[PDB]
């Protein structure tokens, strides 16, 4: 029942994509990362924000961040985590609607070769 | 609905403090690290061990105990210091619990720049943890809105530290806000979106145009939105046809080197570094290959020609394009 978690595990390759010109626009970036970040930052701010004695209330309210922060790389299925925050917009490619989902990667590279 | 409401309930459920209860409790911290400093230099615990290792114990709602050991063997000059530090251990008891609510109502401002209301509390709230602490109990202004700074100033240091940007020292945000407010400044006082060089004057020393452009070329919040519309293709990393035109040129040379003499072929191999990758000098080639450079240098050029001469009469001058 090692379903409890203590070490999410994201790769890095897929992202480090850089400048695209022609016609009329350039500049270049990726997602899953800025999506990833959410995590580490928290899981990092937790530790250093406890060691300096952050009594009760605070502690949980934070920590849990990781939890929520974990339902990140995983599946955005609840309230959402739009980019452009506040940003009333698009859905962070969190293995939902894309990668593993349907018609994004799986339904794509299985036959849509 | 955000999980904030959950916290917003636990936070605004417990009352703050009266007024005199703010200081009375604080003074316990002073003599806290002080009375703990007694044992600090006493055995050399740097006054941070006895406290940090005990504040854990103070948080007896969760871990350790340990240190007490020697703190009970208390000599004839001790037992009073046992309670003092345990009465002072109450210094880290109630304080810190009130403010949690007092702050939040501040983060309602930075509801934009970066980090959602919920993450901003982490930074904002944590600033209180440090600021609570270095409170000059002396002054007669009493804790309150005076903490707001530590919070907000820790919030600005937060939004700076964290943003969909790579690395932002106050070297660009404070400057981009400039050209921004400046471009927006000249704007209302002109009518058209001012150029880049036109802003140079607005700024000053060293502020030409190139630099004004280098800044708004790094970031603010662009770096694309990431993935709209595998929003973009392209390629050329391990080129397919290339890695195939590679083995050719090589195997091709092996053939183009067939009509060669060992006292020249190998001479070339090692020389230009074809054997493995050792671009051995002409000395290493001369040592092993006995004879001193003389006839060797000639064998060197003896090649080239005998290697180019065999080309114009038989194509292969196309392998160069790859």
UniProtKB/Swiss-Prot annotation, chain A:
Function: DNA-dependent RNA polymerase catalyzes the transcription of DNA into RNA using the four ribonucleoside triphosphates as substrates.
Family: Belongs to the RNA polymerase beta' chain family.
Assembly with partners or alone: The RNAP catalytic core consists of 2 alpha, 1 beta, 1 beta' and 1 omega subunit. When a sigma factor is associated with the core the holoenzyme is formed, which can initiate transcription.
Protein name per Swiss-Prot or TrEMBL: DNA-directed RNA polymerase subunit beta'
Organism, scientific name: Thermus aquaticus
Gene: rpoC
Swiss-Prot record, chain B:
A GO BP entry: DNA-templated transcription initiation
Primary location: cytoplasm
Subcellular locations according to the entry: Cytoplasm
Annotated segments matching region Sigma-70 factor domain-3: 174-243
Domain of life (superkingdom): Bacteria
Annotated region described as Sigma-70 factor domain-4, given as residue ranges: 256-308
Residue range(s) of DNA binding per entry: 282-301
A Gene Ontology molecular function term of the record: sigma factor activity
Spans annotated as Sigma-70 factor domain-2: 95-165
Region (Sigma-70 factor domain-1): 1-36
UniProt KW Mitochondrion keyword: no
Cellular component GO terms, alphabetical: cytoplasm
Keywords, in A-Z order: Cytoplasm, DNA-binding, Sigma factor, Transcription, Transcription regulation
KW Transcription (keyword) present: yes
Motif mapping: Interaction with polymerase core subunit RpoC: 119-122
Domain comment as written in the entry: Contains 4 domains, connected by flexible linkers. In the active conformation, the domains are in an extended conformation, each making extensive interactions with the RNA polymerase catalytic core. In the autoinhibited state, sigma-70 factor domain-1 packs closely together with sigma-70 factor domains-2 and -4, contrary to the extended conformation that is seen when the protein is part of the RNA polymerase holoenzyme.
Family: Belongs to the sigma-70 factor family. RpoD/SigA subfamily.
Function: Sigma factors are initiation factors that promote the attachment of RNA polymerase to specific initiation sites and are then released. This sigma factor is the primary sigma factor during exponential growth.
Entry protein name: RNA polymerase sigma factor SigA
Annotated source species: Thermus aquaticus
Residue range from the parent sequence: 93 to 438 of 438
